[PDB]
Structure formats: C-alpha cells, structure tokens
Amino acid sequence: GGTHIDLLFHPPRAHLLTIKETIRKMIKEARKVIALVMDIFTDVDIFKEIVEASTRGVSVYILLDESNFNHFLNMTEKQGCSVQRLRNIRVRTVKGQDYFHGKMEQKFLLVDCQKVMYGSYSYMWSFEKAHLSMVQIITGQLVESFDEEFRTLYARSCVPSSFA
Amino acid sequence: GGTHIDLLFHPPRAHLLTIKETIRKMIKEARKVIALVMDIFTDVDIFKEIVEASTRGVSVYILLDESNFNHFLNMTEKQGCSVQRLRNIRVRTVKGQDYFHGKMEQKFLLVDCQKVMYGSYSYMWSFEKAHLSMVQIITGQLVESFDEEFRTLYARSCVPSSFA
Ligand SMILES: Fc1ccc(Cn2cnc3ccccc32)cc1
Ligand SMILES: Fc1ccc(Cn2cnc3ccccc32)cc1
Ligand SMILES: Fc1ccc(Cn2cnc3ccccc32)cc1
Ligand SMILES: Fc1ccc(Cn2cnc3ccccc32)cc1
C-alpha cells in the first residue's frame, strides 16, 4: 500500500486533459464525499459541477481562505445559487495570524478519500487563461495525510460571518 | 527506485523544524546545485543562505515570477548584494499570458537533483509570521520530474529587464 503521483500542467504538457477538465472530471465521478480546500473560488464552471455533485447526494465540504471568501460569495450570488439553501454543501472559512491579514495558503481537492489534486491551481478564470501552474494527482497512502490535514483545517475554521 | 514524501506544516505539526528552518537547512547542505522556482522572494534570511551557498561553490539557478521580480530586486539592493556581481547565481523571470498580468504560479526548491521542497510556502516574511501553509519534502524518482519541470520553465524564461 504505497503512493502514486502524476503531474499535470497548465498549459498542458503530455497529458490529454487540462487541469480544469481534470477537476471537473474528478467532481463528476465523486460518489460520496468532496473535501475542498481553496484560497479563492470564483470559477463558475467548477462551482456548477460541485452543485451538481451535491444534488446527486454527494456530501461536499469546502474550506475557504477567510480574506477572499467575499469573492466566492459574490460568485454564488451571481449564479443565483446560495450555498446556505443547498443541503449537501457546507462551507467554513480559515484564516492565519493577523499583523495585515494572515491567510490560509493551502489548496487541494480530496474526493472519496481516494484521490487528491494538490498544487498551485486556484479555482479562478485567471488559472485557465493567464497563469502557469502545476498539480499532482495523488492516490494511495498519502491521501490519508490529506484527509488528516483537511480535518485539522476544519477544526480551526469558523462559520462565515455572512451565514445566519 | 520509488518516491518518498514527508509533509511539513506552518505552524509546525509533529515535526521538529519549521518549514523555514528546513529551507535554510536544505540550502546549507547543498553540495552542487540549487534550483529554485519562486513567485515572490523577499526573505532576507533565506537569501543570505543562498549567497552563502554560492560562495561555497554551489551553482544557484533562480526562476522568479516576472510581475513580482521588483520585490526581489529591492530586497537584494537593501542587502547590498547585487545578484549580477555574484558569479555562481543566475536569475531569470517567467511570466504567463497577459489579458491583467499572467503569472508563474509555481514554486519549489530542488537541491542537488536529490531533494525537492514543494508546496504553498513563498519566501516572504508573511509565510513565517502570518500564513498557514504546507510543503512536501520529496526524494526518489519524482525528483526527476521536478528537474524536468525546472528545465522546461527555464526554457520559457527571460533575462530580467533590469540586467545589462
Ligand atoms: F472531516 C469532517 C467532515 C465534515 C465536517 C463538518 N463540516 C461542516 N462544514 C464543513 C466545512 C468544511 C469541512 C467540514 C465541514 C467536519 C469534519
Ligand atoms: F488548455 C489551454 C492551453 C492554452 C491556453 C492558452 N495559453 C497558452 N499559453 C498559456 C500560458 C498560460 C496560460 C494559458 C496559456 C489555455 C488553455
Ligand atoms: F538546467 C539548466 C540549468 C541552468 C541553466 C542556465 N541558467 C542561467 N540562468 C538560469 C536561471 C535559472 C535556471 C537556469 C539558468 C539552464 C538549464
Ligand atoms: F514556528 C512558528 C510557530 C508559530 C508562529 C506564530 N503563529 C502561531 N499561529 C500561527 C498561524 C500562522 C502563522 C504563524 C503562526 C510562528 C512560527
């Protein structure tokens, strides 16, 4: 029981799918649980995929950096898709130490305790159109460490102010 | 010939050294080559460690995101340590597509083609004092993929404007 890792790139290099298509595919194929940790989440296509997973019965847990959470909120309002009236999705924020706002600079997508996407790709249009990035697709034993990290971050997260 | 990965955290969790102490240690123990890919590099302690490696005879290659390269330049000026009169260090910039500046959102430290630190820790004071982050220490076969990525990024890099 070891670990397997493949690298994907943006723009793509020697693989067939873009990182975004891979994210959308990983979400489409979720059966049970999506755990997501993200610094900025404004990408509407990835959001729609997540909402769709939630309607299928997949439990979705999202931890967002506090300082950027408004951008996600704005986007869900645009999409006419309040995350509070979506039963299967739960969202909390994570912050670092203030001095200047400290941030959660972590991101990864952890699906069905089976597969992780970890890297520098944030869920924003600029990462499709403008930025160079890279991710790892991880399976095997190291996925349990991402599971543990997700739980550790959740334990230090807060209910976003917005939410009543 | 497989791959080994350990995780480090900031703030630290179940390991003795901080990520920064680990970065400084990895640089101290470099024998031959440092290859560094960084989005923002303003941390003076890590810089001093790199300069010191260079004086020992270690070849140092640094690829920085173009849009933030001025912050690195500013810092080297403050430190009275021009990277152009340092024989063993070479620095080029990498950019993404413009629309709004596209960025190289990649970072990793690759020492002696043996060990990689990959994760969300940027070489700035805020990552010591303020932000939550995580890295992987990688050895074994996957290190060759970081070597290849470093070379691919170098091939798409430019001489920084500043430099004559
Ligand atoms: F492992 C866990 C799985 C679910 C919860 C409960 N929960 C509620 N909202 C959440 C947001 C992000 C993450 C978790 C969340 C706790 C731990
Ligand atoms: F799959 C794609 C392949 C190429 C592009 C457009 N493009 C070309 N070079 C790029 C560098 C960074 C970011 C985007 C880039 C978008 C999607
Ligand atoms: F693998 C390579 C190792 C060194 C060079 C030559 N070079 C000169 N400046 C550099 C900056 C960053 C990286 C490389 C650099 C090319 C390829
Ligand atoms: F090794 C260290 C251990 C703790 C601190 C100070 N601190 C405490 N909690 C933090 C969260 C995010 C960032 C810094 C933090 C600095 C260095």
Side-chain angles (χ1 to χ4, degrees), chain A residues 103-164:
Chain A
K103 282 174 196 188
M104 180 195 71
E105 300 281 1
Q106 304 215 202
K107 43 193 181 272
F108 61 87
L109 172 60
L110 162 57
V111 175
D112 293 334
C113 310
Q114 172 184 156
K115 190 182 275 173
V116 171
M117 180 190 294
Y118 176 65
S120 50
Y121 188 96
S122 296
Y123 295 4
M124 328 167 54
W125 87 282
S126 53
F127 281 84
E128 225 216 282
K129 295 320 189 190
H131 296 324
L132 307 173
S133 70
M134 174 185 18
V135 296
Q136 306 176 339
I137 310 295
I138 313 183
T139 56
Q141 185 168 352
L142 183 63
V143 173
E144 309 170 31
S145 304
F146 282 88
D147 192 76
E148 174 161 71
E149 168 66 346
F150 186 75
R151 291 173 198 267
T152 302
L153 288 167
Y154 160 69
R156 65 140 74 220
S157 67
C158 304
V159 172
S161 350
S162 341
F163 296 5

Side-chain angles (χ1 to χ4, degrees), chain A residues 62-86 88-126:
Chain A
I62 309 171
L63 297 178
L64 296 182
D65 166 69
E66 198 185 280
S67 77
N68 287 115
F69 175 80
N70 56 302
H71 296 302
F72 168 78
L73 197 49
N74 286 166
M75 179 272 285
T76 55
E77 290 215 320
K78 257 226 180 47
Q79 298 301 313
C81 225
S82 180
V83 86
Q84 284 164 108
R85 53 135 262 284
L86 278 163
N88 281 342
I89 300 188
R90 293 192 154 182
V91 187
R92 301 172 60 103
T93 56
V94 182
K95 73 154 181 92
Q97 279 275 38
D98 297 315
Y99 279 70
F100 168 76
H101 313 140
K103 282 174 196 188
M104 180 195 71
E105 300 281 1
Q106 304 215 202
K107 43 193 181 272
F108 61 87
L109 172 60
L110 162 57
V111 175
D112 293 334
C113 310
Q114 172 184 156
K115 190 182 275 173
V116 171
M117 180 190 294
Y118 176 65
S120 50
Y121 188 96
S122 296
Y123 295 4
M124 328 167 54
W125 87 282
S126 53

Side-chain angles (χ1 to χ4, degrees), chain B residues 40-86 88-138:
Chain B
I40 298 167
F41 185 179
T42 67
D43 184 295
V44 165
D45 301 309
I46 297 170
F47 182 66
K48 154 268 158 52
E49 219 63 67
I50 276 172
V51 175
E52 282 189 17
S54 75
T55 76
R56 248 142 55 213
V58 175
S59 304
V60 181
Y61 304 88
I62 309 171
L63 297 178
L64 296 182
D65 166 69
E66 198 185 280
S67 77
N68 287 115
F69 175 80
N70 56 302
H71 296 302
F72 168 78
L73 197 49
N74 286 166
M75 179 272 285
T76 55
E77 290 215 320
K78 257 226 180 47
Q79 298 301 313
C81 225
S82 180
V83 86
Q84 284 164 108
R85 53 135 262 284
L86 278 163
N88 281 342
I89 300 188
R90 293 192 154 182
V91 187
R92 301 172 60 103
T93 56
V94 182
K95 73 154 181 92
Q97 279 275 38
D98 297 315
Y99 279 70
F100 168 76
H101 313 140
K103 282 174 196 188
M104 180 195 71
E105 300 281 1
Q106 304 215 202
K107 43 193 181 272
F108 61 87
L109 172 60
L110 162 57
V111 175
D112 293 334
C113 310
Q114 172 184 156
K115 190 182 275 173
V116 171
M117 180 190 294
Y118 176 65
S120 50
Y121 188 96
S122 296
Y123 295 4
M124 328 167 54
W125 87 282
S126 53
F127 281 84
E128 225 216 282
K129 295 320 189 190
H131 296 324
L132 307 173
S133 70
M134 174 185 18
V135 296
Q136 306 176 339
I137 310 295
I138 313 183

Side-chain angles (χ1 to χ4, degrees), chain A residues 12-76:
Chain A
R13 294 224 285 282
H15 51 89
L16 295 169
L17 296 187
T18 63
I19 289 174
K20 189 170 157 158
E21 293 165 322
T22 307
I23 292 160
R24 296 184 71 173
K25 172 185 180 73
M26 274 172 79
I27 297 165
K28 270 177 207 170
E29 299 178 348
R31 290 184 348 91
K32 304 305 187 189
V33 186
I34 293 159
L36 173 62
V37 179
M38 186 55 54
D39 48 6
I40 298 167
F41 185 179
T42 67
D43 184 295
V44 165
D45 301 309
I46 297 170
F47 182 66
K48 154 268 158 52
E49 219 63 67
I50 276 172
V51 175
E52 282 189 17
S54 75
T55 76
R56 248 142 55 213
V58 175
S59 304
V60 181
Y61 304 88
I62 309 171
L63 297 178
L64 296 182
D65 166 69
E66 198 185 280
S67 77
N68 287 115
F69 175 80
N70 56 302
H71 296 302
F72 168 78
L73 197 49
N74 286 166
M75 179 272 285
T76 55

Side-chain angles (χ1 to χ4, degrees), chain B residues 8-22:
Chain B
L8 305 177
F9 298 94
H10 196 80
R13 294 224 285 282
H15 51 89
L16 295 169
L17 296 187
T18 63
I19 289 174
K20 189 170 157 158
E21 293 165 322
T22 307

